[PDB]
Amino acid sequence: DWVEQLIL
Amino acid sequence: ENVECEVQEFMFAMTLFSFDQSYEIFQLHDIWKDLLCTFTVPHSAFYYQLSLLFDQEFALKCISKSAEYSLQDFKEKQHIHYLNLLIHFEVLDVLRLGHECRTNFLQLLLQEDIDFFSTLLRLCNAHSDKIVDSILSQNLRSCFKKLYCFRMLNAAAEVLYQYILMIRKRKCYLMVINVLSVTLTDLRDELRG
Amino acid sequence: LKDRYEGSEVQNLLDLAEMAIVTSLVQNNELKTLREILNEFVSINVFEVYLKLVQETIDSLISGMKIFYVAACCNVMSQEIVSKILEKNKAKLLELPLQDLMKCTYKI
Amino acid sequence: RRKLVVQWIAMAVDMWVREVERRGAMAAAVMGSWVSELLGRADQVLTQIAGTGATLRGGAASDAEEIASLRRTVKGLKRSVDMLLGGEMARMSFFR
Amino acid sequence: VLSQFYDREDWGQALRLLLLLIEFHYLVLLVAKFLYPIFEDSVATVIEVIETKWSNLYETIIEADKSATLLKNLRKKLNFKLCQAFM
């Protein structure tokens, strides 16, 4: 979740 | 050990060869057809013959030692042998610089060389940081290709990349721009178009 | 004029000349150009041409000055370097010497 | 005759490199260090074969330049593979 | 930062940093500094994008880090390219 929000 | 105790020495050598003891005795001092040829020649010949006969450790060692002690036909042969033995077991760069200081021969040798060869070349370039350079460029010109070319030339890189281009596009344009840092403007415009 | 605007040489033979030489940057054409120049008789370019057909230091300085006076100049410089390399194939040589940077480094 | 085995490896890795380069251009619109090590050993085998060939009984071997050529090809492939492994493979979809 | 404190992990962190920089001058400088300190295809692509993307506060930050910047960055990029070529 935290790494999906960083990629966005 | 018995019946032998100059001639007896050579006898001991050839007998102990048919390996450490043999080589040692031989060096310290100074199949039948080959032996006769060697006798007629009379170190280089002896080592060559031994290497041929064991063609292994003994052979390779003797050959290397003789080649070292010596340093067109003989030279080329010795070099080829050494390189092959080393690649089977640095050597490349050494031999190259040596011969530079028979061009088609070298072209064939490098032909055989072509991953290990590439690594060696990279090492040589790092160390550095005419004929040899041209030969290398030609062999490379004969992704992978572009990369090798670029690495070696370090204009040739840029030219090769442009030719290949005439994801991939972006990467190329980018690499070109970084290397250059007119051309940049053109590349940018093309990427934007 | 119609040629400069659409992007000739015989007409010119009959600054701008330097730009034409720039565009040109074969041996026979060079010789013909040289003959035309002789008939007409910039100086630096002439010295360079004379060297190519073939004091050397003076020609070199002239060419460097011309280069300073962009792509064509660099090309000419590279050509001169190649020619010097061909001629070489000690102190005088060092005096004459005194991607291009990479080449110079390899030379040193 | 391991000369011939090295030639097969050279040809296989070459096609592999071409495939990776093609697949990179494809996606704009695995290889490990073991392949690099393998080409180094291959260069050593060729250095060993050439040396043995120079000291054969009856006269030197005729394949001297043939092996020198293979050495160059192998080095070229190790160079390409080393560049891909070193980062050029993660930057294949990028403009140069 | 956690990943940094903890080779592949380091690469992943560097990639994340490049991605963040793309999404966003000071940040870019910090990233360049980190890359220099560290000193494949994906990495090269990122470096390239950064070069393409490339005031007083930024200069001050650069000075603090050293304790010219563009040149150092170009040098680092060249080094990275060389490394990729060797690989």
As a whole number of angstroms, the distance between CA E2 and CA E25 comes to: 23
Cα separation, B99 vs B122, in Å, equals 19
Q: Are D28 and D93 in contact (CB under 8 A)?
A: yes
Compute CA distances B91 → D24, D38, D65, whole Å.
Answer: 34, 17, 17
Max Cα distance, chain E (Å): 38
Q: Which residue of E has its CA nearest to A5?
A: E20
Chain A: give the shortest CA distance to residue E23, in Å: 8
Query: Do B62 and B50 form a contact (C-beta atoms < 8 A)?
Result: yes
Question: What are the angstrom distances between the C-alpha of A1 and each of A6, E2, E54?
Answer: 9, 17, 30
Flag whether residue B154 sits within 8 Å of chain C, measured between CB atoms: yes
> Which among B151, B178, B188 has the least Cβ separation from residue E86?
B151
Sign of CA dihedral B192, B193, C4, C8: positive
Greatest CA separation for chain D: 59
Expressed in Å, this structure's resolution amounts to 37.0
**CB burial class (10 A; 0-12, 13-18, 19+) of residue C39?**
exposed
Show residues of chain E in contact with D82, CB under 8 Å.
85-87
The whole-angstrom separation of Cα B63 and Cα B82 is: 8
Taken in order C15, C17, C18, C23, the sign of the CA dihedral is: positive
| 3-class SS of residue D92 | coil
Angstrom distance (rounded) from CA B139 to CA D70: 11
The size of chain C, in residues, is: 108
Give the type of residue at C38: L
Which among B52, D33, C43, B95 is positioned nearest to E87, based on CA atoms?
D33
Give the start-end residues of each E strand in chain E: none
- DSSP letter at E49 equals H
Q: Provide the greatest CA pair distance for chain A.
A: 11
Give dist(CA C50, CA D13) in Å, integer: 52
3-state secondary structure of D66: helix
Q: Strand, coil or helix: what is B95?
A: helix
Among candidate residues B50, B68, B69, the one with its CA nearest the CA of residue B60:
B50
Contact across the interface for C102 and B133, Cβ inside 8 Å: no
Owner of token pair 């080449």: C103
Residue B109 parent element (H or E): helix B103-113
The alpha carbon of residue B172 and the mean position of all alpha carbons in its chain are separated, in whole angstroms, by 32
Distances (CA, A) of B44 to B41, B60, B102, C12, D63: 9, 13, 21, 70, 21
Which chain B residue lies closest to D74 (C-alpha atoms)?
B114
Q: Do chains A and B touch (3 or more CB pairs under 8 A)?
A: no
Whether D16 and D31 have beta carbons less than 8 Å apart is answered as: yes
How was this structure obtained?
cryo-EM
Annotate D11-64 with DSSP letters as a single string: HHHHHHHHHHHHHHHHHH----HHHHHHHHHHHHHHHHHHHHHHT-TTS--TTH
* Encoded amino acid at C36, one letter: E
User: Alpha helices, DSSP H only, in chain C?
Assistant: 2-6, 9-13, 16-24, 27-40, 43-53, 56-68, 71-88, 91-95, 100-107
Inter-residue contact B131 to B105 (CB < 8 Å): no
Is the Cβ of D33 closer than 8 Å to some Cβ of chain B?
no
Tokens, residue D65: 């330049």
Contact E87 D94 (CB under 8 A): no
Q: Touching check for A4 and chain E: CB below 8 Å?
A: no
**Residue E79: φ, ψ to 5°:** -55, -45
Residues D86 and B27: their CA atoms lie apart, in Å, by 47
Residues of C in contact with B153 (CB under 8 A): 99, 102
User: Whole-angstrom Cα distance, residue E18 to residue E50?
Assistant: 7
Residues of B with CB below 8 A from E49's CB? 174
Q: Nearest 5°: CA angle at B80, between B75 and B83?
A: 125
Helix (H) or strand (E) holding D95: strand D95-95
Query: Is B155's CB within 8 Å of C99's CB?
Result: yes
Integer Cα distance of D72 and B141 in angstroms: 12
- SS3 of D71, please? helix
